[PDB]
Amino acid sequence: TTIAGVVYKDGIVLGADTRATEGMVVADKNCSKIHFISPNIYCCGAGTAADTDMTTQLISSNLELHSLSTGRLPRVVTANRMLKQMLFRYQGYIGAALVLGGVDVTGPHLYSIYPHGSTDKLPYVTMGSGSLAAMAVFEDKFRPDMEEEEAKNLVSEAIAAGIFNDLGSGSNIDLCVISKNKLDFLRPYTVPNKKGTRLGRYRCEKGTTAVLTEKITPLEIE
Amino acid sequence: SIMSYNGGAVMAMKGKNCVAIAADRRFGIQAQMVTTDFQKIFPMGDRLYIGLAGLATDVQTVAQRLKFRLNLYELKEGRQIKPYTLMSMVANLLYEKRFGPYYTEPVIAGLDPKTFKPFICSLDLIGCPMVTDDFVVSGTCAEQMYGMCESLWEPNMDPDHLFETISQAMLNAVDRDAVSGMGVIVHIIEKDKITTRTLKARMD
Amino acid sequence: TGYDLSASTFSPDGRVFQVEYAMKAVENSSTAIGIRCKDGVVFGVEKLVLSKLYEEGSNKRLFNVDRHVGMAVAGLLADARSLADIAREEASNFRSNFGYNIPLKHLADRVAMYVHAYTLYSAVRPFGCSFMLGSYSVNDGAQLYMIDPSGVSYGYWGCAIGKARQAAKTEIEKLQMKEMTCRDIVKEVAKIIYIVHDEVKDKAFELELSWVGELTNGRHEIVPKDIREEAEKYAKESLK
Amino acid sequence: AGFDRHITIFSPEGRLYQVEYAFKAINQGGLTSVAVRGKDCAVIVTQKKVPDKLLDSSTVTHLFKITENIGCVMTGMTADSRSQVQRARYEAANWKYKYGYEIPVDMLCKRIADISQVYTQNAEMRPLGCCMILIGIDEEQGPQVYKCDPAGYYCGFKATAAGVKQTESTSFLEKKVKKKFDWTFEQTVETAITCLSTVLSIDFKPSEIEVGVVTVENPKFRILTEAEIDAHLVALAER
Amino acid sequence: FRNQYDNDVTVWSPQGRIHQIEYAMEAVKQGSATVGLKSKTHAVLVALKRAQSELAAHQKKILHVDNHIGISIAGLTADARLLCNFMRQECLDSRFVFDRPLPVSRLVSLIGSKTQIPTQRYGRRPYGVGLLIAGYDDMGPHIFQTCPSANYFDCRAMSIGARSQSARTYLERHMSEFMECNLNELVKHGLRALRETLPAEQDLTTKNVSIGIVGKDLEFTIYDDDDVSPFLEGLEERP
Amino acid sequence: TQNPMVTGTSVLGVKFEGGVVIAADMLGSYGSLARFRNISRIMRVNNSTMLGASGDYADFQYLKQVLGQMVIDEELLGDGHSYSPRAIHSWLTRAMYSRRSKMNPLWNTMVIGGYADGESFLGYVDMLGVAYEAPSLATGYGAYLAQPLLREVLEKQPVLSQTEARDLVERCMRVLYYRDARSYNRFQIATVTEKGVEIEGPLSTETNWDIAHMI
Amino acid sequence: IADAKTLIDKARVETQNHWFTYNETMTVESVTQAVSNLALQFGEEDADPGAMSRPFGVALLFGGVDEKGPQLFHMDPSGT
Amino acid sequence: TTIMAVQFDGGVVLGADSRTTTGSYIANRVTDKLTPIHDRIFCCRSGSAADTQAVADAVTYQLGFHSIELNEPPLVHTAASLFKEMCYRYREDLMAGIIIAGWDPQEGGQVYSVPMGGMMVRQSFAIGGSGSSYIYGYVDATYREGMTKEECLQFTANALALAMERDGSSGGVIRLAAIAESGVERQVLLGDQIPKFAVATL
Amino acid sequence: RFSPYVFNGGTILAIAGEDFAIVASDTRLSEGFSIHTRDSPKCYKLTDKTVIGCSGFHGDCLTLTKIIEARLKMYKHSNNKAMTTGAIAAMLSTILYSRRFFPYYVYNIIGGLDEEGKGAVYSFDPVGSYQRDSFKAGGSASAMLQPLLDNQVGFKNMQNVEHVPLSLDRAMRLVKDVFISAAERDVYTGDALRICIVTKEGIREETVSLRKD
């Protein structure tokens, strides 16, 4: 897993890979590691996938209630505090490394949340197995007050560096741009690698497989 | 691992206006088969099926608990569950026991109640849902059957071609593992019918 | 009219009469007064001697709720002793958690809230005690607080509770406590108590006094008996 | 009857008379409070009556600070007022702890009011016989004025009063907003003081009233000194 | 009428009196009389026991809590037994924890708290029993009384139960000599005092008298029917 | 405290005619580091009692707060009674034994010293709740080093004066400073008497390093 | 008869508990006190739900030979 | 990490490095370990970041509620006592070393040290964290009574620089704060601004 | 890491008689190789007719003595009589078994006079199994002491030797001698012996010196 985020001049850009590995076999491709917490707050997740999914969903629901009651868009600090307090209560047994990104009345905020309840507000963050390579790219090429296209290019480069160099990561790249004005969620922004053409067709003709028994049960379409 | 104690294999595949779900039949305690008729695929609807591989006890237990929840859902809401909603329910059930997990790796395969768009997904030990457009696999022989699926599968397959592909993949995969085999059953779900066939396989 | 039976109830005109009935409890009590001056706070109680059999230094209405604060009570003595236990617990908890001696204003607020809890619920009656609290700290200064059965709390330059509250209050009013010092204030407290005491209705009383201030280094303590005797002789002389 | 004397039971007309009696409990105190909003400021005024000379005037107050940037004025039972003030302070601090930002005035009022609702629905406890009026500045919405009542109604207001002269005071304020030109800080304070003084007939002196203000320039709630109050009062008399 | 305000302890009366507590205080008057008096070196408890019938044995009116404390009861034997169990466990806890005899003043304070809790809450009745607590500690001999109201007193001497005013007046007129008395003189004084309470026809006997003595060298001992004969023989006759 | 964190060593005590004296170094060591060098490891429980501790300083501070509140509340009720050193020792034995039984031990071993009713008291309490009374006491490495000297002088002379007892504890502190790494030069001395408790400020041991040149 | 059965059960279990703990036989006075303590609980000083609110509407006569010889004890609904 | 506080007459100077690490990876090189518990009370945080952040937020909550209900500025000793109670009650499950420093009108500038295990000591200067080991000698020699505010700032900067160069866990930029009656003046020293000391340079 | 026990040493002895019982113990408390104190008698007077001796972990000895004293008071209050030696023994068995799973590390001996007037000694394992014995030694030096008691008092393995009822004087001589031998050859036991003899008169305490280490 590589997830990464950066703050550009008028918002945030979040990026992640789309590979899920159970052991050392790629259990899934085109997995979505960018989650919805609120209209203005999206969060990437890494670590235990179920923990990331469920904690992000729970905080999404709590912030939905909070925003409904207060009548104003949710703040990023509220999401950060909810997440960190839950994670601290569970003492790291729920395993989630999260890049929390959203824009609110204060401005653009990017937070990085560790499994034990630590949080860090930063201009740029990375998490997962490829965090070191992504951080290498960020440390090299991040500059303050970047434009949106520049930030997208940087995050794509970092997630790509994580993809190629790290084994656990690798698939299409996803991007998400949150601005004060708009949100653009970009399932595959880039497709760095593709499966090669199958030279030989092995399509099994009918009758290739023997069958001891069969039972056809008609369904009453209606 | 504890998952390897009983052993199993479950597979699902997506064609065109059809799904196939297939699983082995062996039930054995670490090496000694007991029965060649274990039910690892259970019906969760008219054209929605679940497939459980892992510990036999947790297979049966999560199947029964899910049927409890699903029957109450169908009675309360007066409609058949959508496949994605069954996925979410199963994920909630498994994550409820995030500590002391049910040792299963479920697979859901079915058609949408109205669109009849095909749906396949898999869940991990602790309820991580993964939806795929090509195939999903679970059990001891995930590695072998993953490779076999990645080779054989093709998009927009006919029902007959889907049956041939899933049959070949399960048979050749379970041939190369010790703890699964003793026959395989293939369920084919189409909008108009369910076709269940038991293949001829090596009983070794 | 069933409105007065319980404290959960309200009168149709917006009055919780059980609390007022409990306020009438303290008026049965013998008077007690506390006066605050520059150096510190002096407390005094008119402890009626019901029988010769009872030991002196018994039925004490002046309690020490912490080293730096003292409590004087009027109303039901059982409820008062219980409230004193509550106040001592609050002070000890404050010291244990926040690491220093409780401010008197905060202590009064906490015990007042504990008292106010009881006026709300139907299961339990309001307290039948009204009590005064006083402390001196070099930071805060001299502070005197009074808590009614309702849970109302306020700071008083001079205060009286019990049967002779009104007469004691006018006598205290003509005193100018702010300029004065504690060793005079004990004498004037004795004078006021001897004035308000009714010899016909009340057979006899033993003046019970205490103070806190700089002269104690900020510890509430019972008056030394020599000073008690001097103040009592002065009060008898002034009474005429 | 018997349909009163318990909060739970409904009248045959479905009115819950007990809470209506709690509303009378506010007027039993004999004090009035007024709150009026301005373009850049919100103010709260209330009578300050010291029954005895011996009472320390500093201690007696109906103006409390729920948090650094929110202030309240309570009208009704003093003890219930103090308890609700404590609950409000706890709610504000707990909001800051959980959600990382200062509680909005509207959400504080909503929390206190729904607590008052749980009081008016459960049997054994009684509604607190007090009324709260909260003033603060919200960055998005500017100044705010809100009121809780024993029932659980928490509506916001341009200007309000509570206490015995509430109807007279709101009649006075209604005329003033109707002839709306603006309210700067000085005019806001003057409107509050004129409303209170006119309805009571008091012709106040600085000791008799206590005023608290919030302003967009200085968001913190502050209780003005007797000198500032006299400065405003003299300006009223001069014109 | 005022039958209302008498039903429960939790209802104040319009003149600030909790009538159920007073009705409980009436309970002590029902029981047979008891007298307690002290000297500089000793504390004494003496009692008048009652019997249901000639065949029945006389009831136990003096109970030992600890070596250094013992009690005598007037009022409900049930409440007496319960409170005695509580006191015994408190003293045992003090000896276990601190390895010191519990101060008698502190013990009666604990009794007062435990007794006070019923009066304020709905539910359990006030403990309708009056106890005389007598003990020796480092400070000296002590005698206390506890009412069904949780208030307690410290006494030079005291008498509780039926017709105890006669004993109280005898004790008051003879009190000055008690302090310097021998234990024999002191028990004789107390015996005459309870003899005042008896009917004129009745007289003190070995059977209906129980004596309880504690001192610096003497642990609490209840001298029973046979053992009271040394103390009783000195007494002369009825006046 | 399953693991001690910041610890102090070697509180010594000996009972003299008309009182008791206890002395302790003012160092709390963070595992071979002299992290805290002005901490006071002796407390004034009441006018008639002293207490000093070796082991985890945090447990000592907790016991200080608890026992001090206990002393305060008895002073508040103010019936003329007060806790004896025997009473404080018994309660402390109970508390330490209970925390041991709960397997949440208070790591400290404490000396309770007091003079009341004309009789001196000096008692030991361990983290496991082992407790006893004796003429002289030494905790930590004091038990191995100082206690022989104290026992020799006390066995030959059962009763000792305040002056010679003070000289003795000073000599034992000198020995412990020589031959214990966790020890410190600065130490306090505190003595209970008929008058009361007085704790002397930082006191220091003259040290003889003559054998260094002998080499 | 019913609350009598209850008190008899209490007496029996207390006698056997005494035998278990101290390897001896209770006195008639001690057994009568044991049942009396149960009878006292109508006051509801204890917070336990399983105590009858009403007093026990039965009187018992306890007769037994103890260290003091033959003894006859009377018990009443009050618990005296 | 290295955290250091020193008391000057009328206030305190707090100082800390910016480095937090996971193993040998510097997860954040710009961390802020000096947090405001209150307007004039700060804590220097060393130990587990999650533990320290949680306890800091909790103490901030409690001290704010206490301060508002008392209607008085809170005391540094009060904040330190709250920290002690938390850290001692959870000493087994908690890994934090805190230095509580601030200004209150009653007692002026104060510095309190809460090491691991939950004990409270007041110190004229306090150092904590992994890197404090290396600079114990420097602070012991260099410290002099009655230093000025600027002198204490330079002292804290030099000590933290030495600990930073000699400790891998410590590093980054030096974050310094001066708390007094007037208010908090926070500054960051970076690059050349950080004090540098010569190398052996054979 | 934390060990809830330490062996504080000491030995206890009890020897019954036709009309008497004796209970005797060392007065040394020793943790590890160091001597905590030389005057800490292990014998405690429960009643006029009973003495208990405890050896093992001293904290458990102390708490068990306090518990037994408290329950003795409670029995006195409830039953209006003093506990007999057998009653104390059974109560102690139950108390010890209460903590089967976190035991008291103590070896207990109860010595006293029974209701009939004869001497009785009750001997307990750490977990509360108890047996009436004519004599027994407990603690560190049980192995050394008990064989000689078996030979002299029980006349075991002695041929053509008459059996005499033990006398108070002979018993005390034997107790002093056996404790002297245990002082010689057991490191833990020494520096004094407290002999507590119970008769119809009551407890009588004699102390005799044993060699300091």
CSV table of N, CA, C and O in Angstrom, one decimal, chain G residues 14-27 30, chain I residues 67-68 70-79 81-95 122 130:
chain,number,residue,atom,x,y,z
G,14,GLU,N,-28.1,-22.8,58.1
G,14,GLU,CA,-27.1,-22.1,59.0
G,14,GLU,C,-26.5,-23.2,59.9
G,14,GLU,O,-25.3,-23.1,60.2
G,15,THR,N,-27.3,-24.1,60.4
G,15,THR,CA,-26.7,-25.2,61.2
G,15,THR,C,-25.6,-25.9,60.5
G,15,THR,O,-24.5,-26.2,61.0
G,16,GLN,N,-25.9,-26.3,59.2
G,16,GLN,CA,-24.9,-27.0,58.5
G,16,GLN,C,-23.7,-26.2,58.1
G,16,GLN,O,-22.6,-26.7,58.0
G,17,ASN,N,-23.9,-24.9,57.9
G,17,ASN,CA,-22.8,-24.0,57.6
G,17,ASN,C,-21.9,-23.9,58.9
G,17,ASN,O,-20.7,-23.9,58.8
G,18,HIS,N,-22.5,-23.9,60.0
G,18,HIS,CA,-21.7,-23.9,61.3
G,18,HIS,C,-20.9,-25.1,61.4
G,18,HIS,O,-19.8,-25.1,61.8
G,19,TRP,N,-21.6,-26.3,61.1
G,19,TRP,CA,-20.8,-27.5,61.2
G,19,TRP,C,-19.7,-27.5,60.2
G,19,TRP,O,-18.5,-27.9,60.6
G,20,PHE,N,-19.9,-27.1,59.0
G,20,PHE,CA,-18.8,-27.0,58.0
G,20,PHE,C,-17.7,-26.1,58.5
G,20,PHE,O,-16.5,-26.5,58.4
G,21,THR,N,-18.0,-25.0,59.0
G,21,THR,CA,-16.9,-24.0,59.3
G,21,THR,C,-16.2,-24.3,60.6
G,21,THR,O,-14.9,-24.2,60.6
G,22,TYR,N,-16.9,-24.7,61.6
G,22,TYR,CA,-16.3,-24.8,63.0
G,22,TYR,C,-16.3,-26.3,63.5
G,22,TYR,O,-15.9,-26.5,64.6
G,23,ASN,N,-16.9,-27.2,62.8
G,23,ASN,CA,-16.9,-28.6,63.2
G,23,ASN,C,-17.6,-28.8,64.6
G,23,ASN,O,-17.1,-29.4,65.5
G,24,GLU,N,-18.7,-28.1,64.8
G,24,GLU,CA,-19.4,-28.2,66.0
G,24,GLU,C,-20.9,-27.9,65.7
G,24,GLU,O,-21.3,-27.6,64.6
G,25,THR,N,-21.7,-28.1,66.8
G,25,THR,CA,-23.2,-27.9,66.7
G,25,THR,C,-23.6,-26.6,67.3
G,25,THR,O,-23.1,-26.2,68.4
G,26,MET,N,-24.4,-25.9,66.6
G,26,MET,CA,-24.9,-24.6,67.1
G,26,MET,C,-25.7,-24.7,68.3
G,26,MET,O,-26.3,-25.8,68.6
G,27,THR,N,-25.7,-23.6,69.1
G,27,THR,CA,-26.6,-23.5,70.2
G,27,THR,C,-28.0,-23.1,69.7
G,27,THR,O,-28.2,-22.5,68.6
G,30,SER,N,-28.2,-19.4,69.2
G,30,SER,CA,-27.5,-19.0,68.0
G,30,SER,C,-28.4,-19.3,66.7
G,30,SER,O,-28.5,-18.5,65.8
I,67,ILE,N,-6.9,-11.9,60.9
I,67,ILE,CA,-8.2,-12.5,60.5
I,67,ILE,C,-8.7,-13.4,61.6
I,67,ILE,O,-9.9,-13.4,61.9
I,68,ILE,N,-7.9,-14.2,62.1
I,68,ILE,CA,-8.3,-15.2,63.2
I,68,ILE,C,-8.8,-14.4,64.4
I,68,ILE,O,-9.8,-14.8,65.0
I,70,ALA,N,-10.1,-11.4,64.5
I,70,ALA,CA,-11.3,-10.8,64.2
I,70,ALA,C,-12.5,-11.8,64.2
I,70,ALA,O,-13.5,-11.5,64.7
I,71,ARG,N,-12.3,-12.9,63.5
I,71,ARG,CA,-13.3,-13.9,63.5
I,71,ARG,C,-13.6,-14.5,64.9
I,71,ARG,O,-14.7,-15.0,65.1
I,72,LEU,N,-12.5,-14.6,65.7
I,72,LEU,CA,-12.8,-15.0,67.1
I,72,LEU,C,-13.7,-14.0,67.8
I,72,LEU,O,-14.6,-14.5,68.5
I,73,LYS,N,-13.4,-12.7,67.6
I,73,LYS,CA,-14.3,-11.7,68.2
I,73,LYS,C,-15.8,-11.9,67.6
I,73,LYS,O,-16.7,-11.8,68.4
I,74,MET,N,-15.9,-12.1,66.3
I,74,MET,CA,-17.2,-12.3,65.7
I,74,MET,C,-17.9,-13.5,66.3
I,74,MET,O,-19.1,-13.4,66.5
I,75,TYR,N,-17.2,-14.6,66.4
I,75,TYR,CA,-17.8,-15.8,67.0
I,75,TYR,C,-18.3,-15.5,68.4
I,75,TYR,O,-19.4,-16.0,68.8
I,76,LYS,N,-17.5,-14.8,69.2
I,76,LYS,CA,-17.8,-14.5,70.6
I,76,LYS,C,-19.1,-13.6,70.6
I,76,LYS,O,-20.0,-13.9,71.4
I,77,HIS,N,-19.2,-12.6,69.7
I,77,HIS,CA,-20.4,-11.8,69.7
I,77,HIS,C,-21.6,-12.6,69.3
I,77,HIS,O,-22.7,-12.5,69.9
I,78,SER,N,-21.5,-13.4,68.3
I,78,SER,CA,-22.7,-14.1,67.8
I,78,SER,C,-23.1,-15.2,68.7
I,78,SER,O,-24.3,-15.3,69.0
I,79,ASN,N,-22.2,-16.1,69.2
I,79,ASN,CA,-22.6,-17.3,69.9
I,79,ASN,C,-22.5,-17.1,71.5
I,79,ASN,O,-22.9,-18.0,72.2
I,81,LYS,N,-19.9,-17.3,73.4
I,81,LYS,CA,-18.9,-18.3,73.9
I,81,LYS,C,-17.6,-18.1,73.2
I,81,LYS,O,-17.6,-17.5,72.1
I,82,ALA,N,-16.6,-18.6,73.8
I,82,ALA,CA,-15.3,-18.6,73.1
I,82,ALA,C,-15.1,-19.8,72.2
I,82,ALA,O,-15.6,-20.9,72.4
I,83,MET,N,-14.3,-19.6,71.1
I,83,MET,CA,-14.1,-20.7,70.2
I,83,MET,C,-13.2,-21.7,70.9
I,83,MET,O,-12.2,-21.4,71.6
I,84,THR,N,-13.5,-23.0,70.6
I,84,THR,CA,-12.7,-24.0,71.1
I,84,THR,C,-11.5,-24.2,70.1
I,84,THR,O,-11.5,-23.6,69.0
I,85,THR,N,-10.6,-25.0,70.5
I,85,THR,CA,-9.4,-25.2,69.7
I,85,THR,C,-9.8,-25.9,68.4
I,85,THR,O,-9.3,-25.6,67.3
I,86,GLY,N,-10.6,-26.9,68.5
I,86,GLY,CA,-11.1,-27.6,67.2
I,86,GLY,C,-11.9,-26.6,66.3
I,86,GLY,O,-11.7,-26.7,65.1
I,87,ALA,N,-12.7,-25.8,66.9
I,87,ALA,CA,-13.4,-24.8,66.1
I,87,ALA,C,-12.5,-23.8,65.4
I,87,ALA,O,-12.6,-23.6,64.2
I,88,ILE,N,-11.4,-23.4,66.1
I,88,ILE,CA,-10.4,-22.5,65.5
I,88,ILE,C,-9.7,-23.3,64.4
I,88,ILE,O,-9.4,-22.7,63.3
I,89,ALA,N,-9.5,-24.5,64.6
I,89,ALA,CA,-8.8,-25.3,63.6
I,89,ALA,C,-9.6,-25.5,62.3
I,89,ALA,O,-9.1,-25.2,61.2
I,90,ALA,N,-10.9,-25.8,62.4
I,90,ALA,CA,-11.7,-25.9,61.3
I,90,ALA,C,-11.9,-24.6,60.6
I,90,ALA,O,-11.9,-24.5,59.3
I,91,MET,N,-12.1,-23.5,61.3
I,91,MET,CA,-12.2,-22.2,60.7
I,91,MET,C,-10.9,-21.8,60.0
I,91,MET,O,-11.0,-21.2,58.9
I,92,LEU,N,-9.8,-22.2,60.5
I,92,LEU,CA,-8.5,-21.9,59.9
I,92,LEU,C,-8.4,-22.7,58.6
I,92,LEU,O,-7.9,-22.2,57.6
I,93,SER,N,-8.8,-23.9,58.6
I,93,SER,CA,-8.8,-24.8,57.4
I,93,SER,C,-9.6,-24.1,56.3
I,93,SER,O,-9.2,-24.0,55.2
I,94,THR,N,-10.8,-23.7,56.6
I,94,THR,CA,-11.7,-23.0,55.6
I,94,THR,C,-11.0,-21.7,55.1
I,94,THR,O,-11.1,-21.4,53.9
I,95,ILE,N,-10.4,-20.9,56.1
I,95,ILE,CA,-9.8,-19.7,55.7
I,95,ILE,C,-8.7,-19.9,54.7
I,95,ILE,O,-8.5,-19.2,53.7
I,122,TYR,N,-3.2,-29.2,66.6
I,122,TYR,CA,-3.7,-29.3,65.2
I,122,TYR,C,-2.7,-28.7,64.3
I,122,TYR,O,-2.2,-27.6,64.5
I,130,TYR,N,-5.9,-30.4,57.7
I,130,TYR,CA,-5.5,-30.3,59.1
I,130,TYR,C,-5.8,-31.7,59.7
I,130,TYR,O,-6.8,-32.4,59.4
